[PDB]
Ligand binder design. Structure first.
Ligand SMILES: [Mg+2]
Ligand SMILES: [Mg+2]
Ligand SMILES: [Mg+2]
Ligand SMILES: [Mg+2]
Ligand SMILES: [Mg+2]
Ligand SMILES: [Mg+2]
Ligand SMILES: [Mg+2]
Ligand SMILES: [Mg+2]
Ligand SMILES: [Mg+2]
Ligand SMILES: [Mg+2]
Ligand SMILES: [Mg+2]
Ligand SMILES: [Mg+2]
Ligand SMILES: [Mg+2]
Ligand SMILES: [Mg+2]
Ligand SMILES: [Mg+2]
Ligand SMILES: [Mg+2]
Ligand SMILES: [Mg+2]
Ligand SMILES: [Mg+2]
Ligand SMILES: [Mg+2]
Ligand SMILES: [Mg+2]
Ligand SMILES: [Mg+2]
Ligand SMILES: [Mg+2]
Ligand SMILES: [Mg+2]
Ligand SMILES: [Mg+2]
Ligand SMILES: [Mg+2]
Ligand SMILES: [Mg+2]
Ligand SMILES: [Mg+2]
Ligand SMILES: [Mg+2]
Ligand SMILES: [Mg+2]
Ligand SMILES: [Mg+2]
Ligand SMILES: [Mg+2]
Ligand SMILES: [Mg+2]
Ligand SMILES: [Mg+2]
Ligand SMILES: [Mg+2]
Ligand SMILES: [Mg+2]
Ligand SMILES: [Mg+2]
Ligand SMILES: [Mg+2]
Ligand SMILES: [Mg+2]
Ligand SMILES: [Mg+2]
Ligand SMILES: [Mg+2]
Ligand SMILES: [Mg+2]
Ligand SMILES: [Mg+2]
Ligand SMILES: [Mg+2]
Ligand SMILES: [Mg+2]
Ligand SMILES: [Mg+2]
Ligand SMILES: [Mg+2]
Ligand SMILES: [Mg+2]
Ligand SMILES: [Mg+2]
Ligand SMILES: [Mg+2]
Ligand SMILES: [Mg+2]
Ligand SMILES: [Mg+2]
Ligand SMILES: [Mg+2]
Ligand SMILES: [Mg+2]
Ligand SMILES: [Mg+2]
Ligand SMILES: [Mg+2]
Ligand SMILES: [Mg+2]
Ligand SMILES: [Mg+2]
Ligand SMILES: [Mg+2]
Ligand SMILES: [Mg+2]
Ligand SMILES: [Mg+2]
Ligand SMILES: [Mg+2]
Ligand SMILES: [Mg+2]
Ligand SMILES: [Mg+2]
Ligand SMILES: [Mg+2]
Ligand SMILES: [Mg+2]
Ligand SMILES: [Mg+2]
Ligand SMILES: [Mg+2]
Ligand SMILES: [Mg+2]
Ligand SMILES: [Mg+2]
Ligand SMILES: [Mg+2]
Ligand SMILES: [Mg+2]
Ligand SMILES: [Mg+2]
Ligand SMILES: [Mg+2]
Ligand SMILES: [Mg+2]
Ligand SMILES: [Mg+2]
Ligand SMILES: [Mg+2]
Ligand SMILES: [Mg+2]
Ligand SMILES: [Mg+2]
Ligand SMILES: [Mg+2]
Ligand SMILES: [Mg+2]
Ligand SMILES: [Mg+2]
Ligand SMILES: [Mg+2]
Ligand SMILES: [Mg+2]
Ligand SMILES: [Mg+2]
Ligand SMILES: [Mg+2]
Ligand SMILES: [Mg+2]
Ligand SMILES: [Mg+2]
Ligand SMILES: [Mg+2]
Ligand SMILES: [Mg+2]
Ligand SMILES: [Mg+2]
Ligand SMILES: [Mg+2]
Ligand SMILES: [Mg+2]
Ligand SMILES: [Mg+2]
Ligand SMILES: [Mg+2]
Ligand SMILES: [Mg+2]
Ligand SMILES: [Mg+2]
Ligand SMILES: [Mg+2]
Ligand SMILES: [Mg+2]
Ligand SMILES: [Mg+2]
Ligand SMILES: [Mg+2]
Ligand SMILES: [Mg+2]
Ligand SMILES: [Mg+2]
Ligand SMILES: [Mg+2]
Ligand SMILES: [Mg+2]
Ligand SMILES: [Mg+2]
Ligand SMILES: [Mg+2]
Ligand SMILES: [Mg+2]
Ligand SMILES: [Mg+2]
Ligand SMILES: [Mg+2]
Ligand SMILES: [Mg+2]
Ligand SMILES: [Mg+2]
Ligand SMILES: [Mg+2]
Ligand SMILES: [Mg+2]
Ligand SMILES: [Mg+2]
Ligand SMILES: [Mg+2]
Ligand SMILES: [Mg+2]
Ligand SMILES: [Mg+2]
Ligand SMILES: [Zn+2]
Lengths: 53, 12, 158, 105, 53, 164, 210, 1119
């Protein structure tokens, strides 16, 4: 496995969750700081996203 | 099957 | 087939296996020509077969051994490839670089990330070739062979 | 001269075995103590596998670089240091076929 | 992972003008500050420096 | 029965020696010095002889064998090379050849090439060394050119530092 | 990293429906059901059920309480579910132990655990094969775009442990690096395999440039 | 100097003989010194008796009976020292009295036959095999008895296990699977436990009722009644059940084996195995093991009880029969003796196997000596055991301790019938019974943990490998000065208390007092305390018990400490620690460090070589002193006399000190003042900064002796001559070679210099055409010989101090074949403390010297005196060893108080007491300061402010009073020797004992440029002079792979190691100033393809288009 490319055209993506459940049975919680960082840091947006402004 | 025996048997 | 100490010779176990084959095969030929009672022809072809297995891969049908002293498996051709005795482990355990070194380490406070401090003594050995030519470049030595002898002894280095 | 880009394993045609080899080691003769030299046509043998010295021959009819790729008259010995004696292969001519255990077991 | 209770390091020499090229460009120490694991800094004030600062 | 063929005579000989050592292992309580064995065996037996025999007796050990603290270490990597000119010798041959060739071109062919070829090209004969010109013209240019050769080389010291 | 039978496997729900339970002495029973059909799920005494009488359960949802066998989840919720699960489940151990590595990395290896799909509808070589996914994206592509006569190569997503994943790759070279050399080569021989040097491991034995 | 000690738990009994394990064991092993008449017959005499009556009867003509009379050794071939100078194994001869009988007339008694030369034990405990001192390490295993462990997988009922060692003794297991079978397995396949009992006589009815009436399970016994109805028939029946094709009529044949003699037997009658039996299960066993051969009708007081207890275990509570294998009463120790008697017997057999053949070969009657005895077996066997047995290795004598500890070390790794490398996780754990029997921390650090451990101080191996420990008897609330060495097993049986229990002498002092039942801690009452622990010291090893305040050190780091000392290099400047524990004296003494006086008397002469004293008994003896002998590890060992001329000596008083004994006290480092703060990063994570001043005084300097050696080999090209002739270049380099060949005494040899000249012959068999022209040119006539002379290896060399030459006409040495003559040259060098050297205190703080500073500017106290060493503090919170801090402080006192202290392990000095002595110290330090004429500095007050603001000094009080408080805290004000300003904040300083660590050959800064290369694989290789190439393994390969270091990785695989044509072209290319050529084919690769070609497989590379490409350039094409 090695990087050798051009923007590979297939745009099948994945959505990283930002909330975890089970610990306190079912109590939605914002995922801890690092974990998120570990899932999104320096990635490439599959699609645009309008957020806080 | 481990030689020896077979040929011993063979000519014996 | 090398000379060791005095009269001690040392060879790859492969060679014994080869003779095993060579002899049988020869005995075979003689055995066919000289006349040939079925039993004996087969009995040999059998041995001959087993022999061929031996150098290819021993232990797959039985274990051939060097005469009394070491019930050691004569490293079959595959044993040498796969490394049945931990040879693969040693193989990927690493080869040996020609321009390397090793020594204890000690914190270098003033040193900068950029650099690191290494013993000139070690440097000499490591960068010997590059040093030799630089010597010729300068008046230090007339030529390579010169520069080398010049360094062959510690006490003889200007 | 061309970059090696592909390597492949294939089975060995008995003829191929031949094409690789040189001479036929027909006797279990390694080296006879008297002279640490190869015995007869045995496993170790100059013809079958290559010289034994640097750029010189066995007998000495030729001994320098000038005659880099030509063989000796009364005895066969091409030359470049001992290394060729390594890379070369010989072949043993079996009486009645035997099979490669590898494809059998 | 090295302390100074005797840990011994090794050292090799890049010969080809090429090897040296890659060596001090993409393999030098001051050019690879951040960790491949986490974007986090790998070369940060370790034990003493902190205590000081 | 051996990795190395040995004549039958030498076989019985070794047996004889072996057998002799046994009887010699019967009373001294000392594994008999090559003196005993020489004596006991008979006629022309001597220390040099016995030492030589036993050295041949010994079976060849495995080039591949566990080494030191029984690990992956295999005997083979321990044996060094001698044919192969380790880099330094390669360096040597370069200068030697280059320089010698530079000196071979500045020379009267006749008796310079004769000895150069008779010595370094075929084998090691004064009279039989020169084509048609006899020994007096050989010794003539051989000792006058080689000395004229050795001394201007004494001037521009290129070979002095014994490349060997 | 080695898709295997966990210690306390949790029964996943192959269906997506409503829950129903029972009280008989010896064994309990979880029933999943939609307007169509229903499925019974035997849950022995020690099984602590995470689900309750009354609500929905997506395919491959944890019914029992504990660990899940990837194969199952693969078969029920699909590849995308297995992958996603593997990554998260791994990260679990590390995060709990201070380690902070980026998801990308595990994903990479994850992918290779499923770069092998199986065949059911042949075209050139028979069905039950199990080969490189994109290598099939190749044939299917040209077999329906360049060379006509659409020969749909119906494949099945397959999940295999890192060990196995490698123990059976393209280049025999790589496989000859394991203690299975014997077999690796035998095969590679008979077929006449041309080890296109792609990976590193392979290309290094040759002492070739990386 | 004064000596004050603390803690008082009346150590009722002194330590035992510390080398007793090696010594005693060998004593009893070889019952030599005492006549055959004496009773101890174990070991040799035992093994003797064992294989002596060779009863060979019929198969032609027999009646052979060769008995044993007496075994007597006595006169060793050569003496020890000689055995070391020469390469001879110090061994003693062995010829016992024999006599073989005849069925006819006569019994020729050929008295002696010296077979087998067995080594002897040094007075210290070690041995002298070839040229080095070797030691025999003890072992551990399952004590041949019986146990009952839970069944493998099925969480149902446990099974049984009978363990009979040696290996050629059956291994039985009892397991029932109720639907129709019961399993009794000796070898492998099971069968009815009944078929056996029946044979012995036990009939179904008296069996079922009398054995298993409470055991319903009896039902699985009387099942196969068909067979249980024929007694002795069952005997042949079972014989039929074994498998060869064996005759069904061998009266009491194989039944014998599993009865009396060889197979079952546990060394001695009464306590060897029966103990395990009687205590654990059953009650008796007539005859050592299940034996009898009187009426042909065997008796088994063992077979039935085993099942009895299984039925019992599988039932209620006969007791609670679960066996914790790790219990020390269940794992036994293999003292040297047994380890030797074992191999000894192995040989007795090999011989007995060969002699049997000669009872038929011998003509008629002339068969007593040579016709039945060949010393060849016994020799190879024992010899291999002392020279190749994995259980033996180099005597670690880096210094006395190392030696002593190594002598008393236990290992699991061994034979094969006793623990291998696959198990360990339950073994490597410090089991509960490992109390006063095995130090919990003494084990190594790494792959080998728990497997190899050195026993605790008081630990002693009683009669048969059961580590016992002392324990004093405390009847009622009364404790006794009497002690009982309890077995690991018996210990469980009682309620023992600890040493640290308030005692009024015989009376206990507290109602609720600690005590530990079998494995558990329990607060007991003085009325239940039956036994008590002798002292803290019995809990750990000797090597650990030397640590000052062990109590304040994490058991993990204390290991580093204990192990560290084993690596202690004797310093010319010995010096006992400012604070000792109390064993230092006993150590040097029990170990053979210094020389003590036998009986009272006066000294006569005091030579730097000998001390001839004069005992007041009318005698005078000369006591030589091993000047500067070579220790296996290279550390010196001299005995410097400390007694003056004509001195009345007290019996048992040091006349000479050990290699590292100050005054009969151990001394392995040097007390040295120390500041404990952070410098300019110089003492970074574990770095240390050294005051050049420490070098000004020959403090950490160490004398080292290396031993080089070269041989004159007999080549078929011409013997290698040992001449003062070095064929090619200078006389300058010949100088020191003075003595035609050898190097002159007292000659300084630097790296590269000649140590011994050697001339072998050039080519392999023929000259060289190229080199031929060259020689002729300048001087054809030349010693066409090669220079293979022993040169000073890179790194270093000192001053020659001795040499040895063994030429022809060997006196009594063993010159190997081919070896014409050997040349040894001993070199010595004074090793001074230098950057890179590593030092470590006894608490585990192990750091390396990173910077030698000039006394000029390093930290100095108010009064001139500067600090010697500066220890960073960040290396102390993480590790949890406050012990060193506790040592530094007490030391600070001892400095100005000019005295050394003694603080026992758990019963030593205490914080208040320390604070007290410090209080005393402040008077010395500051008092004189007041009297000499001055008060406090501006800096001294400066630090005081930042001090109170800190919280160390009670604000308000006077500077003088403040400093006292601040001093009592262990810290004082230091001035930066660089600026003169103070270091804001009181800094502790003190006397801390620190050692210098030995330099392994790896420290010899390796560095290879170009050199040899193996014959077969073409990868670099080092040897005598040229360093070996470094190993470039996969982990590193990847490291490179990770980077875009393409070419760099290729070079490591081509130009630098395997590519023949490469490295060559590479070198040259460099030498001229051109970039290196482009790589060629690696040999490993070529080697590979051919390796494959050897096999049918054909490996062919290919081009762009599937077409050939040539790796073996031109050598593959044919002709
Ligand atoms: Mg894209
Ligand atoms: Mg036969
Ligand atoms: Mg047959
Ligand atoms: Mg040879
Ligand atoms: Mg080999
Ligand atoms: Mg006939
Ligand atoms: Mg017939
Ligand atoms: Mg052999
Ligand atoms: Mg000089
Ligand atoms: Mg010969
Ligand atoms: Mg040879
Ligand atoms: Mg030949
Ligand atoms: Mg040559
Ligand atoms: Mg030519
Ligand atoms: Mg040619
Ligand atoms: Mg020609
Ligand atoms: Mg010719
Ligand atoms: Mg080759
Ligand atoms: Mg570190
Ligand atoms: Mg450290
Ligand atoms: Mg470390
Ligand atoms: Mg490298
Ligand atoms: Mg850096
Ligand atoms: Mg620090
Ligand atoms: Mg003799
Ligand atoms: Mg001989
Ligand atoms: Mg070794
Ligand atoms: Mg090994
Ligand atoms: Mg090797
Ligand atoms: Mg060897
Ligand atoms: Mg190797
Ligand atoms: Mg060689
Ligand atoms: Mg050289
Ligand atoms: Mg030159
Ligand atoms: Mg002319
Ligand atoms: Mg002329
Ligand atoms: Mg000539
Ligand atoms: Mg002539
Ligand atoms: Mg002529
Ligand atoms: Mg002529
Ligand atoms: Mg003429
Ligand atoms: Mg002249
Ligand atoms: Mg000259
Ligand atoms: Mg439906
Ligand atoms: Mg359904
Ligand atoms: Mg989880
Ligand atoms: Mg946490
Ligand atoms: Mg953690
Ligand atoms: Mg962490
Ligand atoms: Mg952590
Ligand atoms: Mg995966
Ligand atoms: Mg396609
Ligand atoms: Mg088409
Ligand atoms: Mg499908
Ligand atoms: Mg391979
Ligand atoms: Mg396999
Ligand atoms: Mg004693
Ligand atoms: Mg004892
Ligand atoms: Mg008889
Ligand atoms: Mg002596
Ligand atoms: Mg001596
Ligand atoms: Mg003596
Ligand atoms: Mg009679
Ligand atoms: Mg007699
Ligand atoms: Mg179990
Ligand atoms: Mg057991
Ligand atoms: Mg056995
Ligand atoms: Mg036995
Ligand atoms: Mg059953
Ligand atoms: Mg039988
Ligand atoms: Mg026993
Ligand atoms: Mg009876
Ligand atoms: Mg009985
Ligand atoms: Mg009886
Ligand atoms: Mg127990
Ligand atoms: Mg034995
Ligand atoms: Mg025998
Ligand atoms: Mg007789
Ligand atoms: Mg006898
Ligand atoms: Mg013997
Ligand atoms: Mg040691
Ligand atoms: Mg075993
Ligand atoms: Mg175990
Ligand atoms: Mg473990
Ligand atoms: Mg203990
Ligand atoms: Mg005991
Ligand atoms: Mg009382
Ligand atoms: Mg009391
Ligand atoms: Mg009493
Ligand atoms: Mg316990
Ligand atoms: Mg009470
Ligand atoms: Mg701890
Ligand atoms: Mg004592
Ligand atoms: Mg004396
Ligand atoms: Mg005294
Ligand atoms: Mg001292
Ligand atoms: Mg002293
Ligand atoms: Mg510092
Ligand atoms: Mg020196
Ligand atoms: Mg030769
Ligand atoms: Mg003489
Ligand atoms: Mg010697
Ligand atoms: Mg430190
Ligand atoms: Mg202090
Ligand atoms: Mg105390
Ligand atoms: Mg205390
Ligand atoms: Mg007090
Ligand atoms: Mg205080
Ligand atoms: Mg100062
Ligand atoms: Mg200050
Ligand atoms: Mg060499
Ligand atoms: Mg070397
Ligand atoms: Mg090395
Ligand atoms: Mg070049
Ligand atoms: Mg084409
Ligand atoms: Mg070529
Ligand atoms: Mg060809
Ligand atoms: Zn020729």
């Amino acid at each position: 496995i090695v990087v050798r490319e051009a923007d590979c055209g297939t745009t099948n993506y994945i959505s990283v969750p930002l909330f975890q459940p089970d610990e306190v049975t079912r109590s939605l919680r914002l995922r801890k700081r690092a974990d998120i960082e570990a899932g999104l840091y320096g990635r490439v947006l599959a699609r645009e996203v309008e957020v806080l402004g | 099957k481990i030689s020896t025996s077979d040929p011993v048997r063979q000519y014996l | 087939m090398v000379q060791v100490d005095g009269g001690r010779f040392a060879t790859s176990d492969l060679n014994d296996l080869y003779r095993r084959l060579i002899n049988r095969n020869n005995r075979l030929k003689k055995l066919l020509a000289q006349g040939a009672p079925e039993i004996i022809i087969r009995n040999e072809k059998r041995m001959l077969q087993e022999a061929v297995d031996a150098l290819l891969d021993n232990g797959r049908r039985g274990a051939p051994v060097t005469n009394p002293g070491s019930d050691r498996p004569l490293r079959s051709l595959t044993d040498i490839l796969s490394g049945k005795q931990g040879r693969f482990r040693q193989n990927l355990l690493g080869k040996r670089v020609d321009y390397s070194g090793r020594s204890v380490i000690v914190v270098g406070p003033q040193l900068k990330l950029h650099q690191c401090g290494l013993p000139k003594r070690m440097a000499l050995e490591l960068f010997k070739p590059f040093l030799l030519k630089k010597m010729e470049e300068k008046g230090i030595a007339p030529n390579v062979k010169a520069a080398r002898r010049m360094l062959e002894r510690q006490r003889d280095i200007k | 001269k061309k970059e090696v880009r592909k390597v492949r394993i294939a089975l060995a045609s008995p003829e191929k075995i031949r094409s690789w080899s040189y001479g036929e080691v027909e006797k279990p003769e390694t080296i006879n103590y008297r002279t640490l030299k190869p015995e007869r046509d045995g496993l170790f043998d100059e013809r079958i596998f290559g010289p034994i010295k640097d750029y010189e021959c066995a007998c000495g009819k030729y001994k320098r670089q000038r005659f880099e790729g030509k063989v000796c008259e009364r005895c066969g010995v091409e030359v470049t240091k001992s290394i060729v004696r390594r890379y070369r292969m010989g072949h043993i001519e079996l009486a009645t076929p035997a099979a490669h255990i590898w494809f059998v077991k | 992972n090295a302390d100074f209770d005797g840990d011994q390091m090794a050292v090799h020499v890049p010969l080809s003008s090429f090897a040296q090229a890659e060596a001090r460009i993409q393999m030098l120490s001051a050019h690879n500050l951040l960790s491949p694991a986490s974007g986090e800094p790998l070369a940060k004030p370790s034990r003493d420096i902190i205590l000081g600062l | 029965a051996r990795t190395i063929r040995i004549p039958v005579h030498m076989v019985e000989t070794i047996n004889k020696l072996s057998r002799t050592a046994r009887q010699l292992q019967q009373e001294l309580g000392r594994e008999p010095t090559y003196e005993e064995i020489a004596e006991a065996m008979g006629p022309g037996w001597d220390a040099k002889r016995v030492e030589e025999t036993l050295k041949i007796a010994q079976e060849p050990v495995s080039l591949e064998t566990p080494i030191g603290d029984e690990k992956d270490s295999f005997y083979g990597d321990f044996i060094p090379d001698e044919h192969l000119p380790s880099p330094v010798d390669a360096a040597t041959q370069s200068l030697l050849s280059e320089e010698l060739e530079k000196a071979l071109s500045k020379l009267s062919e006749r008796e310079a090439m004769v000895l150069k070829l008779r010595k370094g090209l075929i084998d090691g004969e004064e009279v039989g060394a020169f084509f048609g010109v006899t020994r007096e013209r050989i010794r003539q240019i051989e000792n006058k050119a080689l000395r004229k050769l050795k001394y201007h080389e004494s001037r521009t010291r290129k070979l002095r530092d014994f490349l060997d | 990293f080695e898709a295997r039978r966990p210690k306390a496997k949790a029964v996943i729900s192959e269906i997506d429906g409503v829950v129903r339970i029972e009280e008989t002495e010896e064994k309990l029973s979880v029933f999943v059901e939609s307007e169509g059909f229903s499925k019974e799920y035997k849950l022995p005494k020690e099984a602590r059920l995470l689900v309750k009488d009354g609500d929905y359960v997506e395919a491959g949802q944890p019914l029992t309480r504990g660990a899940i066998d990837p194969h199952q989840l693969l078969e029920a919720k699909g590849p995308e579910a297995v992958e996603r699960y593997l990554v998260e489940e791994i990260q679990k151990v590390y995060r709990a132990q201070g380690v902070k590595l980026h998801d990308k990395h595990i994903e990479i290896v994850v992918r290779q655990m499923m770069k092998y799909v199986e065949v059911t509808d042949p075209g050139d070589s028979r069905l039950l094969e199990g080969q490189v996914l994109e290598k099939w994206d190749v044939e299917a592509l040209n077999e329906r775009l360049i060379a006509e006569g659409k020969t749909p190569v119906a494949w099945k997503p397959l999940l295999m442990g890192v060990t196995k994943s490698a123990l059976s790759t393209k280049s025999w070279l790589s496989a000859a690096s394991f203690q299975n050399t014997t077999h690796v080569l035998t095969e590679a021989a008979i077929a006449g395999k041309k080890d296109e040097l792609i990976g590193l491991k392979e290309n290094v034995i040759l002492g070739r440039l990386i | 100097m004064e000596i004050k000690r603390f803690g008082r738990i009346r150590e009722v009994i002194p330590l035992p003989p510390l080398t007793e394990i090696q010594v005693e064991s060998y004593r009893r092993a070889l019952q030599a010194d005492v006549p055959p008449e004496k009773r101890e017959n174990v070991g040799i005499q035992a093994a003797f008796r064992e294989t002596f009556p060779i009863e060979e009867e019929d198969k032609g003509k027999g009646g052979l009976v060769l008995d044993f009379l007496e075994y007597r050794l006595g006169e060793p071939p050569f003496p020890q020292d000689e055995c070391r100078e020469k390469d001879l194994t110090y061994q003693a001869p062995l010829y016992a009295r024999l006599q073989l009988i005849h069925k006819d007339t006569g019994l020729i008694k050929e008295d002696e036959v010296f077979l087998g030369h067995i080594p002897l034990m040094t007075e210290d405990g070690s041995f002298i095999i070839n040229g080095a001192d070797r030691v025999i390490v003890s072992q551990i295993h399952r004590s041949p008895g019986v146990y009952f462990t839970p069944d493998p997988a099925r969480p149902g009922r446990y099974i049984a296990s009978i363990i009979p060692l040696p290996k050629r003794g059956p291994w039985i297991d009892l397991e029932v699977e109720p639907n129709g079978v019961v399993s009794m397995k000796v070898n492998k396949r099971k069968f009815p436990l009944v078929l056996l009992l029946r044979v012995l006589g036990y009939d179904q009815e008296t069996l079922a009722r009398e054995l298993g009436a409470y055991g319903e399970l009896v039902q699985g016994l009387m099942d196969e009644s068909v067979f249980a109805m024929r007694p002795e028939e069952a005997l042949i029946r079972l014989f039929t059940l074994l498998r060869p094709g064996d005759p069904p009529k061998r009266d009491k044949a194989v039944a014998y084996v599993y009865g009396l003699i060889a197979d079952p037997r546990r060394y001695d009658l009464g306590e060897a195995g029966r103990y395990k039996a009687e205590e654990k299960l059953g009650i008796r066993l007539s005859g050592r093991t299940l034996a009898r051969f009187e009426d042909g009708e065997f008796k088994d007081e063992v077979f039935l009880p085993t099942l009895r207890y299984l039925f019992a275990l599988t039932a209620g509570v006969p007791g609670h029969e679960v066996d914790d294998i790790d219990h020390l009463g269940n794992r036994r120790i293999r003292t040297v003796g047994e380890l030797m008697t074992d191999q000894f017997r192995v040989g007795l057999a090999r011989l007995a196997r060969g002699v049997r053949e000669r009872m038929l070969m011998g003509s008629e009657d002339s068969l007593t000596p040579a016709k039945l005895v060949n010393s060849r077996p016994l020799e190879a066997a024992i010899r291999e055991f002392f020279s190749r047995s994995q259980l033996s290795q180099f005597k670690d004598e880096t210094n006395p301790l190392s030696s002593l500890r190594h002598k008393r070390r236990i290992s699991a790794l061994g034979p094969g019938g006793l623990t291998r490398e696959r198990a360990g996780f339950d073994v490597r754990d410090v089991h509960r019974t490992h109390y006063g029997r095995i130090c919990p921390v003494e084990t190594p650090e790494g792959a080998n943990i728990g497997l190899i451990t050195s026993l605790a101080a008081y630990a002693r191996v009683d009669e048969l490998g059961f580590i016992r420990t002392p324990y004093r008897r405390v009847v009622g609330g009364v404790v006794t000065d009497e002690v009982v060495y309890m077995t690991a097993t018996e210990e469980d049986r009682y309620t023992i208390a600890q040493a640290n229990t308030p005692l009024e002498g015989n009376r206990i002092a507290a109602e609720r007092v600690v005590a530990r039942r079998k494995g558990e801690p329990v607060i007991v009452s003085p009325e239940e305390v039956e036994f008590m622990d002798v002292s803290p010291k019995q809990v750990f090893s000797v090597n650990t018990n030397l640590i000052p305040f062990l109590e304040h050190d994490d058991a993990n780091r204390a290991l580093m400490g204990s192990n560290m000392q084993t690596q202690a290099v004797p310093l010319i400047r010995a010096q006992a620690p400012v604070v000792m524990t109390g064993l230092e004296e006993r150590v040097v003494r029990d170990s053979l460090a210094a020389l003590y006086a036998e009986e009272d008397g006066e000294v006569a002469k005091v030579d730097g070589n000998r001390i001839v004293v004069r005992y007041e008994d009318g005698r005078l003896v000369e006591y030589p002193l091993r000047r500067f002998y070579r220790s296996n590890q290279g550390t010196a060992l001299d005995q410097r006399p400390r007694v003056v001329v004509g001195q009345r000596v007290r019996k048992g008083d040091l006349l000479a000190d050990g290699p590292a004994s100050e005054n009969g006290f151990l001394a392995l480092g040097q007390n040295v003042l120390v500041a404990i703060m952070p410098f300019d990063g110089y003492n970074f994570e574990d770095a240390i900064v050294i005051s050049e001043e420490l070098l000004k005084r020959d403090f950490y300097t160490s004398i080292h002796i290396e031993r080089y050696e070269i041989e004159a080999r007999d080549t078929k090209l011409g013997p290698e001559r040992i001449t003062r002739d070095i064929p090619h270049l200078s006389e300058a380099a010949l100088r020191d070679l003075d003595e035609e060949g050898v190097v002159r005494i007292g000659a300084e040899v630097k790296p590269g210099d000649i140590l011994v000249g050697r001339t072998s012959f050039k080519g392999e068999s023929e000259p060289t055409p190229e080199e031929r022209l060259l020689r002729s040119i300048f001087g054809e006539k030349a010693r066409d010989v090669k220079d293979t002379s022993l040169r000073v290896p890179p790194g270093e060399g000192g001053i020659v101090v001795r040499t040895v030459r063994l030429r022809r006409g060997d006196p009594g040495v063993e010159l190997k074949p081919g070896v014409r003559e050997v040349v040894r040259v001993y070199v010595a060098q004074k090793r001074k403390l230098q950057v890179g050297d590593k030092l470590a205190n006894r608490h585990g703080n192990k750091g390396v010297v990173a910077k030698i500073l000039p006394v000029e500017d390093m930290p100095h106290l108010p009064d001139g005196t500067p600090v010697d060493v500066i220890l960073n503090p960040l290396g102390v919170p993480s590790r949890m060893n406050l012990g060193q801090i506790l040592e530094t402080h007490l030391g600070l006192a001892g400095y100005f108080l000019g005295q050394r202290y003694i603080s026992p392990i758990f019963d030593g000095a205490k914080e208040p007491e320390i604070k007290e002595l410090l209080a005393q110290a402040f008077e010395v330090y500051f008092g004189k300061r007041k009297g000499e004429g001055f008060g406090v500095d501006k800096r001294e007050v400066e630090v005081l402010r930042r001090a109170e603001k800190l919280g160390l000094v009670t604000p308000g009080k006077t500077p003088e009073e403040q400093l006292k408080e601040l001093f009592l805290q262990g810290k004082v004000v230091l001035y930066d020797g660089r600026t003169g300003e103070p270091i804001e904040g009181p800094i502790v300083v003190g006397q801390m004992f620190i050692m210098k660590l030995y330099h392994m050959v790896e420290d010899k800064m390796h560095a290879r440029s170009t050199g040899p290369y193996s014959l077969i694989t073409q990868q670099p290789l080092g040897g005598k002079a040229q360093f070996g190439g470094q190993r470039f393994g996969e982990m590193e390969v990847w490291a490179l792979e990770a980077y875009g270091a393409a070419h760099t990785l290729q070079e490591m695989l081509t130009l630098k190691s395997d590519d023949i044509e490469g490295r060559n072209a590479a070198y040259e290319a460099i030498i001229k100033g051109e970039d290196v050529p482009e790589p060629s084919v690696p040999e490993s690769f070529r080697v590979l393809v051919k390796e494959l070609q050897a096999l049918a497989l054909d490996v062919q590379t290919l081009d762009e288009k599937d077409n050939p490409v040539d790796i073996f350039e031109g050598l593959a094409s044919k002709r």
